[PDB]
Amino acid sequence: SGFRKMAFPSGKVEGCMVQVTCGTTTLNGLWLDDVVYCPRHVICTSEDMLNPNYEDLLIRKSNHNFLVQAGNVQLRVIGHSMQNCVLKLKVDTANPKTPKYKFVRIQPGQTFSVLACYNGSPSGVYQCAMRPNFTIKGSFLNGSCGSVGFNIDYDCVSFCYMHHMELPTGVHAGTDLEGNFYGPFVDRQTAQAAGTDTTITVNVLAWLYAAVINGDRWFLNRFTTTLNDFNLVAMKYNYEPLTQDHVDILGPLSAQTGIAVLDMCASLKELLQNGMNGRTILGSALLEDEFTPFDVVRQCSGVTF
Amino acid sequence: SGFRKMAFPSGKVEGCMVQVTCGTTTLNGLWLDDVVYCPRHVICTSEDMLNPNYEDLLIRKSNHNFLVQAGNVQLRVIGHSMQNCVLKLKVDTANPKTPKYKFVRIQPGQTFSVLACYNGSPSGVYQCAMRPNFTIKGSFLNGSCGSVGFNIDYDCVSFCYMHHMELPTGVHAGTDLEGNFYGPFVDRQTAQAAGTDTTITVNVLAWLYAAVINGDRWFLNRFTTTLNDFNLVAMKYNYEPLTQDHVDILGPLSAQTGIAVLDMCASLKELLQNGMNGRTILGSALLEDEFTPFDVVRQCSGVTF
Numbered sequence: 001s002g003f004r005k006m007a008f009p010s011g012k013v014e015g016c017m018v019q020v021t022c023g024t025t026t027l028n029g030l031w032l033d034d035v036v037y038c039p040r041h042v043i044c045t046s047e048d049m050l051n052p053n054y055e056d057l058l059i060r061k062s063n064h065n066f067l068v069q070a071g072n073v074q075l076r077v078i079g080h081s082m083q084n085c086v087l088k089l090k091v092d093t094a095n096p097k098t099p100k101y102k103f104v105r106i107q108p109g110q111t112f113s114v115l116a117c118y119n120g121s122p123s124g125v126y127q128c129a130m131r132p133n134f135t136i137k138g139s140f141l142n143g144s145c146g147s148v149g150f151n152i153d154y155d156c157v158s159f160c161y162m163h164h165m166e167l168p169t170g171v172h173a174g175t176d177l178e179g180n181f182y183g184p185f186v187d188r189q190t191a192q193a194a195g196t197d198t199t200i201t202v203n204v205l206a207w208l209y210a211a212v213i214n215g216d217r218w219f220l221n222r223f224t225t226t227l228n229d230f231n232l233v234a235m236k237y238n239y240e241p242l243t244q245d246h247v248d249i250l251g252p253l254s255a256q257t258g259i260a261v262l263d264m265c266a267s268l269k270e271l272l273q274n275g276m277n278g279r280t281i282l283g284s285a286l287l288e289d290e291f292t293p294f295d296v297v298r299q300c301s302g303v304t305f
Numbered sequence: 306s307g308f309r310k311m312a313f314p315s316g317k318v319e320g321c322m323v324q325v326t327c328g329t330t331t332l333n334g335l336w337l338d339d340v341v342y343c344p345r346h347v348i349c350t351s352e353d354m355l356n357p358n359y360e361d362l363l364i365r366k367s368n369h370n371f372l373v374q375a376g377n378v379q380l381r382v383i384g385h386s387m388q389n390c391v392l393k394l395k396v397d398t399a400n401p402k403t404p405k406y407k408f409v410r411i412q413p414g415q416t417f418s419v420l421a422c423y424n425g426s427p428s429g430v431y432q433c434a435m436r437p438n439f440t441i442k443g444s445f446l447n448g449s450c451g452s453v454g455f456n457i458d459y460d461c462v463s464f465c466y467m468h469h470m471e472l473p474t475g476v477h478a479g480t481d482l483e484g485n486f487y488g489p490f491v492d493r494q495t496a497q498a499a500g501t502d503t504t505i506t507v508n509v510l511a512w513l514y515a516a517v518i519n520g521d522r523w524f525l526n527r528f529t530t531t532l533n534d535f536n537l538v539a540m541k542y543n544y545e546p547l548t549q550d551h552v553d554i555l556g557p558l559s560a561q562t563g564i565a566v567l568d569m570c571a572s573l574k575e576l577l578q579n580g581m582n583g584r585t586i587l588g589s590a591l592l593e594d595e596f597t598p599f600d601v602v603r604q605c606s607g608v609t610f
């Protein structure tokens with residue numbers, strides 16, 4: 001037992017990371033089959049990034065202006081295109097390490113593993129969630145652009161995120177692998193409003209179920225509540241309203257623990273109204289919302305890839 | 306910027322994990338060059354584990370009693386030995402994926418990445434620390450035995466931990482790759498005292514430096530203190546006493562931020578005496594001690610492997 005914030009094994013993705021250089025800018029790319037994906041602002045100089053005309057900038061560029069390197073291996077670029085906010089560089093070689101993979105656009109509240117890279121080399125891996133306002137709270141220094149987020153379901157890598165920017169507020173924004181930004185964000189250096197964030201209520205409930213499974217039970221009540229009564233308190237405290245879809249998803253954890261979902265909601269209500277009294281739950285002094293119900297089940301099931 | 310608990314990329318280690326089965330028990334092994342390392346209690350049945358005579362049990366075993374499988378590949382066992390609390394199985398093949406590697410025995414307070422495995426397949430990766438009492442707070446379900454902890458310094462994998470047991474108290478215990486347990490623990494199913502844990506003071510100071518680097522500054526004081534005065538408060542609150550060796554190690558962070566180490570100690574003192582007032586530091590409502598000074602520098606430097 002025990003419960004930890006746990007990233008997927010990153011081997012399959014390590015073998016897809018390359019370095020992409022264009023003019024002066026170098027960032028990371030994702031080499032799958034015979035295509036390399038990377039943020040399109042690799043073609044920006046530090047003067048352009050206030051309001052770049054990407055079409056006009058890409059037009060000054062030809063295949064040989066893009067340097068793609070896989071470790072020491074140089075790749076030959078035989079085609080280039082812009083799809084939304086990503087560049088797709090066609091290379092004459094297929095990545096011999098290409099995993100089985102999908103491109104997916106995740107929903108707010110879902111989680112994924114991030115492999116932070118610089119100059120095409122992996123530096124570390126960590127788990128995070130797509131916030132309800134479509135930002136993520138990551139660790140992304142300059143040059144981490146092109147780092148990708150992913151999930152793995154037995155041998156299949158579902159890529160869901162590519163890092164593009166840090167906002168002036170210190171949070172992060174990026175696209176799906178088709179180049180569409182999560183959220184209202186654009187790839188230019190300006191002040192951009194992320195908007196009010198909220199807490200992923202269903203994830204907090206999964207984490208409280210994770211805690212009961214692992215012995216932390218001090219927060220269980222002699223009380224219950226109603227979906228609508230609880231949502232009243234969710235509103236006051238900026239929690240996502242809970243729905244019947246969420247209740248269903250928590251079914252498996254309700255059945256493993258024998259604690260009705262609404263009873264668990266009643267425990268959450270009291271934790272929101274009375275704080276935690278300097279106590280801890282799974283080693284945390286606040287309510288953690290970056291575990292999906294699927295995440296919790298994975299850890300307690302021991303699923304492998 | 307941003308600061309996250311970050312594991313090393315696990316690719317190099319994924320390619321070394323194998324399944325080891327002996328009689329009925331199956332757990333994970335580490336296949337390096339032409340040797341497979343695994344916990345010696347793979348030769349225990351569920352009756353033996355109260356007080357097993359490992360020599361007598363190993364004597365009933367021959368090479369062909371050990372089944373080693375690397376994915377689908379079966380390995381031929383041509384030799385077996387017991388070194389402290391690990392088995393070393395000689396196989397007729399060298400792992401073509403063996404990285405450059407060392408076996409190292411870490412000190413309490415240092416960190417490492419854990420690749421949790423079941424049946425020889427990787428399930429996830431996370432960072433943790435060797436507690437001062439020589440336990441770790443991990444996520445280890447049954448069959449995770451043989452999972453290994455490691456560090457990576459540009460291409461070199463320093464293996465430092467192999468998982469053996471969960472203690473009745475829910476914490477975890479294991480050995481170095483020479484089979485010597487960290488701490489006073491033995492591989493039998495009995496109640497074992499871990500002993501008073503303490504907080505890794507130097508790590509907390511590194512994390513406060515990480516917070517200043519990333520904008521969280523509300524905890525900085527108009528006060529300073531002395532090494533001996535601060536250690537008085539460390540004692541009361543079960544913090545490791547701070548030494549001049551620790552002060553030196555924090556030098557680089559002292560210089561990057563312009564905050565003298567003893568001034569930072571003064572901030573820690575006040576946080577220990579007055580709590581955090583329902584505020585947060587790098588998203589945490591308690592004092593985090595699982596980042597070494599080296600860890601913090603790595604994240605803010607962007608080191609790659």
Ligand SMILES: C=CC(=O)N(C)Cc1nc(C(F)(F)F)cs1
Nearest residue numbers: 041049142143145164187188189
């Ligand atoms: C990955 C981020 C990074 O490395 N940097 C230097 C920030 C940048 N932001 C832009 C954008 F989106 F404003 F055009 C281009 S580079």
Ligand SMILES: C=CC(=O)N(C)Cc1nc(C(F)(F)F)cs1
Nearest residue numbers: 346354447448450469492493494
């Ligand atoms: C890795 C732990 C695990 O999977 N289990 C079932 C607990 C075990 N503990 C023992 C020991 F050390 F007491 F002999 C043998 S198996």
